[PDB]
Amino acid sequence: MLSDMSLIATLSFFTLLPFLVAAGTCYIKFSIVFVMVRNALGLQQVPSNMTLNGIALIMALFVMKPIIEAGYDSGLMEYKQYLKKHTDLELARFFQRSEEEAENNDYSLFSLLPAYALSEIKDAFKIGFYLYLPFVVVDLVISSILLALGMMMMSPITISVPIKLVLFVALDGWGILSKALIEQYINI
Amino acid sequence: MLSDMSLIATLSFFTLLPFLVAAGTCYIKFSIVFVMVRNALGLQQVPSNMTLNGIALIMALFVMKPIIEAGSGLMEYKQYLKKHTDLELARFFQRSEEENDYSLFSLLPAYALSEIKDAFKIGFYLYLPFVVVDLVISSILLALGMMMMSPITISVPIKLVLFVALDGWGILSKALIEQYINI
Amino acid sequence: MLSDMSLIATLSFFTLLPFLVAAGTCYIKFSIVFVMVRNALGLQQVPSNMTLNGIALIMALFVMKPIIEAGYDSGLMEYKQYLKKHTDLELARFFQRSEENNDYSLFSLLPAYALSEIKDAFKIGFYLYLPFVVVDLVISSILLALGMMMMSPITISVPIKLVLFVALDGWGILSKALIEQYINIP
Amino acid sequence: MLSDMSLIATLSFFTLLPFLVAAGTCYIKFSIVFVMVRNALGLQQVPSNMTLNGIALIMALFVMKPIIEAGYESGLMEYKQYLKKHTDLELARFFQRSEEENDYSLFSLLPAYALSEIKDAFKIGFYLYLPFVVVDLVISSILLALGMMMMSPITISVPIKLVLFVALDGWGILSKALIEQYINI
Amino acid sequence: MLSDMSLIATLSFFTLLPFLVAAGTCYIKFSIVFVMVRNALGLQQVPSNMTLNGIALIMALFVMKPIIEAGYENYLNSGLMEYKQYLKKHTDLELARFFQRSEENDYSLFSLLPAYALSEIKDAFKIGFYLYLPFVVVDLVISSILLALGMMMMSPITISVPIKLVLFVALDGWGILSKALIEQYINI
Amino acid sequence: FPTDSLVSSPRAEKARL
Amino acid sequence: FPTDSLVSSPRAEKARL
Amino acid sequence: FPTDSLVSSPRAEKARL
Amino acid sequence: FPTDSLVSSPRAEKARL
Amino acid sequence: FPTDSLVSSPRAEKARL
Amino acid sequence: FPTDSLVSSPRAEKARL
Amino acid sequence: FPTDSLVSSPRAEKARL
Amino acid sequence: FPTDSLVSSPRAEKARL
Amino acid sequence: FPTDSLVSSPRAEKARL
Amino acid sequence: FPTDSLVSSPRAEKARL
Amino acid sequence: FPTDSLVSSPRAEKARL
Amino acid sequence: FPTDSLVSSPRAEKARL
Amino acid sequence: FPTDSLVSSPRAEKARL
Amino acid sequence: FPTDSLVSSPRAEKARL
Amino acid sequence: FPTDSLVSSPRAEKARL
Amino acid sequence: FPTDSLVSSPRAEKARL
Amino acid sequence: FPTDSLVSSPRAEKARL
Amino acid sequence: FPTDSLVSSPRAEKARL
Amino acid sequence: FPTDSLVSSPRAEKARL
Amino acid sequence: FPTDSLVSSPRAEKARL
Amino acid sequence: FPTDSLVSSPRAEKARL
Amino acid sequence: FPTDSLVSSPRAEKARL
Amino acid sequence: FPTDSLVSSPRAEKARL
Amino acid sequence: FPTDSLVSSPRAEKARL
Amino acid sequence: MDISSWFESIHVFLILLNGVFFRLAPLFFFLPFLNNGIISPSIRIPVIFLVASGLITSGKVDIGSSVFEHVYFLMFKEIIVGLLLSFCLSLPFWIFHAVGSIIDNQRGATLSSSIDPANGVDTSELAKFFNLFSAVVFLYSGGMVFILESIQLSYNICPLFSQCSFRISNILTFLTLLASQAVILASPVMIVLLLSEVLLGVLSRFAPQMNAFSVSLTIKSLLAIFIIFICSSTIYFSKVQFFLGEHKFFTNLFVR
Amino acid sequence: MSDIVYMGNKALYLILIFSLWPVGIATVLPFGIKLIGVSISLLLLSGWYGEVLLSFCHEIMFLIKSG
Amino acid sequence: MSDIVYMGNKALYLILIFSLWPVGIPFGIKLIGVSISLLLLSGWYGEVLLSFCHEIMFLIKSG
Amino acid sequence: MSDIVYMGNKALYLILIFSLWPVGIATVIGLSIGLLQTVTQLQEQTLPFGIKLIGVSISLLLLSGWYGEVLLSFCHEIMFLIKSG
Amino acid sequence: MSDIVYMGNKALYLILIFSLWPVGIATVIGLSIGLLLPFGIKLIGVSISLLLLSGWYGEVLLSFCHEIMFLIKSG
């Protein structure tokens, strides 16, 4: 089967699996984007947050499949290459400086993961900002129409929800968004 | 009776059962439709989420009765998914995963996204009469001169009586279950 | 006592008690009617929401007390009879047909009962909103007739509605009417 | 191998290790600052607090590397020096007086360090809240002056705050500043 | 040392030690005060409960040092009498009188410990209410100013947090509060 | 106990009866 | 208990009957 | 028991019948 | 029972029929 | 039953038919 | 039935068919 | 105690009776 | 049937055909 | 204890009686 | 079926075609 | 199918083409 | 203390007695 | 301590007494 | 598909091209 | 500390006394 | 595809170029 | 320390005393 | 591509250049 | 630090003292 | 890229320079 | 550093002192 | 490049300097 | 560095000093 | 660089100094 | 050996503790000083069980003769009696919270949520301050002794091991009692603000082109806070009045 | 997406028709006459408005039943 | 950066143009005019918004 | 007399004092601008809001030091009460 | 802790100056059109002003954020 110490190592790794995914495996981007879309559409609990987390986890597993397959030192090297592909190297070098004591080496695993996480969060906020624009435009247009009509005590968000939903249905929404994200995080 | 590995598989599946139901069955459609109706009727929390979730869960259990009775049943579940999902997104996910017989891993997110989109579409369909009556009430109040009068506090009775005359929840549930039933 | 399997059944039933009460017994109608009246008064928090939920729960427990007492078993058939008495049977028949006047199943009867209770509660709410809508319209019409049109009757109407409702004791008579519709007060 | 009683002491220390870290290292400042930033952005639970706590834990490990390695090769004195140079000695002296009547006992240093770090983290959070509060008030003023008595500004301030934090680079520069203040000395 | 009965008694007591400490010491007051202050700041989960609970436990150990020393000297290698005296010093007379059986010095910590716990809860809640006043003052001032400006769709929660934090930092907050609590519980 | 009044809590009507 | 009164007061109706 | 008015309790209708 | 009454009920219609 | 035309009760329509 | 715009229930149309 | 006052607290009614 | 009533109903159209 | 301000505290009523 | 009438159901358009 | 009408469904455009 | 006091208080009444 | 004034906190009232 | 009308859905543009 | 006329100011009261 | 339109869809711009 | 200004801080009162 | 028009897409700018 | 300033900071008051 | 443009994207400024 | 300024920073007051 | 304008982007200032 | 402005940046004040 | 214009960035101040 | 008898006695004592905890937990819920948002779950349960142990060892718990066979009837009776007791003991805090909330609505800070029940200001601050004020005044005026005496009375009226019947017509008046007390207490602020906005409306009638809503909000806020300040002399005795009223009310709920 | 376009245009036309009659009657005692006229117009047309709205609701329910 | 500024300006321009026509083209007459404008320009509004969203999606895919 | 009630009244008193000046300036500005609009028949609501914003901002900027001093004194009094509660 | 009050003053002045331009131009447009549908013109004006001053707002806000970061660098 497995040796005594290798058993401990693999059990510890499997124990830390949720936190390793939380530290970043492209799941952060998907989860943040989906929750931001839910907030933008004016919904608070409708899309069943566990469903969004499930589809985000499935997408992250699909993206991580090449890493898992090429794994089983090969797996660690491939993971480091993926991180270097999808991070900001300057922060990684800064964390290397903070950990050890400007150089040119491959990289450090503990010094690269937080950099990847922060870069992923920044990119997630960028895509969220890109997504919020048409919805806020629709909200402002409807508010202007209502105000120019003469009504002063009509909340625009009461009527903006159907228009936002029909616009997002016409855009086909979630499928195209998932395609865009997976094309960002896939090669070829 | 399951000694070695079927026991482990059964325990794992039952551990993942609620997540699988929420993200792999029709429960999402009914839950989203009910919450959309509640939001449309201008009510904050009057039909508490426990009741709507229970109704949606019972309806999903009724829908999944042939799937339960089939269990071999994995093929029937796959056929149901391909029946109600979007095949183009499943094909794209299959291409992404690899490099007929659509993979179950590919089918789940496609089905979830298709159900979410259909739920949003039907919610938009349901919002229209309420939007119309709210705008009519606001317009007549503006015409009368009550500019500062709140239209929300006065259009709720009209929305409620309209939904009662439509029979509301009964016919809506009948329509949803008829869409998801009859094979 | 509960040797091997009745223990499992009892523990599962007790763990499912909140959802069973929420989607089952008369709690739904009382909660919805109370929240509807609170919204009709024009103020969202005049009674605490927890207070209304607790009052509805107590009334539901009182309604189910005869059912539990008659159960002593026969309690299941008593609950089925109560559900049949207080719901539309056409919807239950439709659900039972979907599953596949002999009998009815709980699975085909609970959603029908829930929908019927929701419909009745919304009907009661619509019947009750109208007098307060009338008071708001009267206040707005008075303000417009006097000439002052920039004022907001929202702040004026709420004290009037509150004082009228508490002066004529709306809550007590409403609770008595609802629980009398369901059972007979001793 | 190891001795009998020393084994008991080591097991006890490792059992209390998570609480000792939670109340005795730089993890407090990072966790509090990140939660404050999340609350300021207006998001409810989007940043997936597990991620923020993991990042804070890794940064704390980076900070604690010198002391951990010093104790790995009597690091208790080094830990006491670290606490002494990162706390207010008045509170430590008061807790020392709370005993019978420049030693700075370890038990008397932990509450002082914890409270001082919490105070510093709150100050950092206040310094962080200002641009976002300014954005919220500015957009609310613009909406109100436009003539709209509805459409709460919190439904429109989220994109502006997010793009501001993106342009600032936000998390990366904030973490660099914090770790430069703490370890780069 | 502990042949066959003192061993059983000691093991039972140490097994009941968590609840005995959590319901018979000064830990309750510190925990309640810290939680109430953290909630009064307007935050929900910014300082982790582990930190506050650990600080409260350390402060309780500081307060309980003499009685712990006496108990260790007597039993393990009189402490009950000292604990009873401590409870008598820090209890309310009315609660103990009620917990006395019937028919018009209270003893029997069996009947005195609940009175001590209730008195601790009451005092901690009083302290929390006292500390709530300046923060509610800031909240009401902000609400009044916002209503005066004409804006009403935004709650003062957004703006209250930085000002409350500034007030607490200027007051120095935690240090002086802990000093006050320790001075209250240590006079001699 | 004049009848030209308001709700007149049950004590009034019982006394008038 | 005059018929031309304001509130029904079911006890008053029973008395009138 | 005039039922033509707004205040016509079910007791009033039963008595009128 | 009238037909041009101000308020009616299912009791009224059932009795009239 | 007359042609009330306000809103016909189901019983009213059934009796009319 | 009036066969005009007074009230159009499903029963009305079904009968007029 | 008076009779025409607008306030008829229960203690006042009991004292008047 | 009012073929030009300016309103719509599936039953009306299916009856027209 | 003047009768003006027709609402009085329970102490006022007890002193009156 | 008309042609100058405003937006109609897809059934009307398909029947016209 | 006309061309001077108001906003029309894509079915109308496809039939026109 | 005055008779037509600005606003009553328990100490004012107790001193009045 | 003038009598005809504002709130007149209880210390002022006790001083008057 | 005239170009002087702003109803220029992508089908119209594709047909014009 | 002549006359606040709007507030209490406990230091002013103690200084006056 | 006439120019000077306020908006320009990417298809129209590409066809113009 | 003027006796009539906008703000009367505790330091001002102590200084005046 | 009018030069003096308002905000333009990157395609228009890179085409002008 | 003028005496007739509107509101003086604590530094201003302390310096003036 | 005239300087008199109301707005100037970064591409416009970089091309002008 | 004018003495008649509206708002003065602490640095301004320290420099003036 | 202009020196007097309503907007001074950082690129403009760096180009001026 | 004119003084006709509100609270200025620290660099401006320090340069003036 | 102008000085009689609106509030400028720190680049302008550091270039003027 | 007597160790078996000791074990039996201890387990019976634990069963009785479980019953008393069954009765006490709803009281520990509907009480805004030991609310489950300030006391940790690792401290709440041991405190509850210690209170139960003290109550039972003080000999203030009444036990019948285990009349009803099925324990489910006993359990539901205990739950419903606990809910009734919690409602009786939470009335002052609830009525003061209601007063604060309606005053806040009068001011206009939560009018945003009053218009749209989806967004706005659904959390009140003055209401929370009033709730805390009433809670601390009740607690420091002798609240704990009154609560324990009420628990003892509840045990006296309906003992643990017996079936008792309730007065439905007397427990259906709780909501109207709460609303009536709230409106009575908040009447001065309500009438002052209503008259102020009526006067401002008259001013707007004589000043046609003017925005009166913002001015109304400002004056409402200032007048409401001033009236609340000058009204801080009519609150203390209401606690004792509630003591007496709630005691007699909970006494008059069962078929005694 | 033909159904979406049809439903949107139908909703807009319903709004137009519903808000056309009272507006035409009122816009085209300083206030009592206008109030009573608007009220009687709405009351007379209330049944027609309700029937049209119920028919549209039945149509949308049938459409969502179909798909 | 570049695309961020472009998107912000495009959103502001869309707000401007959408508020331009219906307002720029008797409260009841104003309401019926607004309704007619919404009915006539709904397709153009939707198509402009969809094209803007497609631009957004292209920018997302490019990354 | 009832230290808790005393502290509550102190808090309400501080609330009134702090909220007096900005609220008064806001309502005075609003009334003045409304009267001007009535006199000259302009019918515009943006001007009062803008001038109110300027005035409230200036007042809150000016009163910050005194606000902080009074609040710190009150907090120190509360801590002193806690020391001997 | 004079830096705290200085930062508060900076925030207040920044809010006032940021709200000065769009609210001021809206007020100017309103008074100009009232001296002889005002909301449409007002919205057009404020949208144009926001489009023109977007870059200035962004650069000033980023400068303020950089200043705050510098302050918390070693504070």
Author numbering:
A (entry chain C): 1 to 72, 93 to 121, 128 to 214
B (entry chain D): 1 to 71, 94 to 121, 131 to 214
C (entry chain E): 1 to 72, 93 to 120, 130 to 215
D (entry chain B): 1 to 73, 94 to 121, 131 to 214
E (entry chain A): 1 to 77, 94 to 120, 131 to 214
F (entry chain t0), G (entry chain u0), H (entry chain x0), I (entry chain a0), J (entry chain v0), K (entry chain w0), ...: 90 to 106
AD (entry chain F): 1 to 256
AE (entry chain J): 1 to 28, 47 to 85
Published text:
The type III secretion system (T3SS) is a large, transmembrane protein machinery used by various pathogenic gram‐negative bacteria to transport virulence factors into the host cell during infection. The T3SS is a large, syringe‐shaped, membrane‐spanning, multimegadalton protein machinery. Here, we combined cryo‐electron microscopy, cross‐linking mass spectrometry, and integrative modeling to determine the structure of the T3SS needle complex from Shigella flexneri.
Regions inside the needle complex, which do not exhibit any symmetry, could be resolved up to 3.6 Å in a map without imposed symmetry (“C1 map”), enabling us to build the de novo atomic model of the proximal needle end and the export apparatus. As in the previously published structures of the Shigella export apparatus (Johnson et al., 2019; Lunelli et al., 2020), our updated cryo‐EM structure includes five SpaP[SctR], four SpaQ[SctS], and one SpaR[SctT] subunit. In addition, we were able to model the N‐terminal domain of the SpaS[SctU] subunit, which was not resolved in our previous reconstruction and also not resolved in the published structures of the Salmonella T3SS. The transport channel at this side is closed by the side chains of the residues F213 of SpaR[SctT] and M178, M179 of the five SpaP[SctR] subunits, while the flanking M177 and M180 do not extend their side chains in the channel lumen. The improved C1 map presented here clearly shows that six MxiI[SctI] subunits assemble into a single helical turn before being continued by the needle protein MxiH[SctF]. The six MxiI[SctI] subunits build the first turn of an upward spiral on the distal side of the export apparatus creating interfaces with all SpaP[SctR] (SpaP[SctR]1–5) and the only SpaR[SctT] subunit of the complex. The β‐strand augments a β‐sheet of the N1 domain of MxiD[SctC] (S112‐V116), anchoring the needle‐ and export apparatus structure within the basal body.
